[PDB]
Design a binder for this molecule. Structure first.
Ligand SMILES: *[C@@H]1O[C@H](CO)[C@@H](O)[C@H](O)[C@H]1NC(C)=O
Lengths: 49, 50
């Protein structure tokens, strides 16, 4: 609507903003992350991972 | 934020295969496949013992 500024989701995290200069809404998505796991045979066998 | 979800090791398409194997073993063999080699028996002859 022509008077809101931000946006929010069910858990109250910002997920949309409107640009001040040009009145347009920009969706926001966080940068990538995740866990890291290493697969290895026994050091008695090899050293590749 | 730092909260991931890991997928299961066995997919649904494999659990379905286990279920189908169990059914096919309990239809054409009775209870004999749970104690050793699976042996044939006709179904109206299994239900007689049951
Ligand atoms: C801000 O300046 C830019 C550059 O001329 C212009 O295009 C824009 O319309 C201006 N903002 C508003 C709200 O008019």
């Amino acid at each position: 609507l022509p008077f809101q500024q931000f946006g929010r989701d069910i858990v109250d995290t910002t997920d949309a903003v409107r640009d001040p200069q040009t009145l347009e809404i920009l969706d926001i998505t966080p940068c990538s992350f995740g866990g890291v796991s290493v697969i290895t045979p026994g050091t008695n066998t090899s050293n590749q991972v | 934020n730092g909260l991931t979800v890991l997928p299961p090791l066995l997919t649904d398409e494999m659990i379905a295969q286990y279920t189908s194997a169990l059914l096919a073993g309990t239809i054409t063999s009775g209870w004999t496949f749970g104690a050793g080699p699976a042996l044939q028996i006709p179904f109206p002859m299994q239900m007689a013992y049951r």
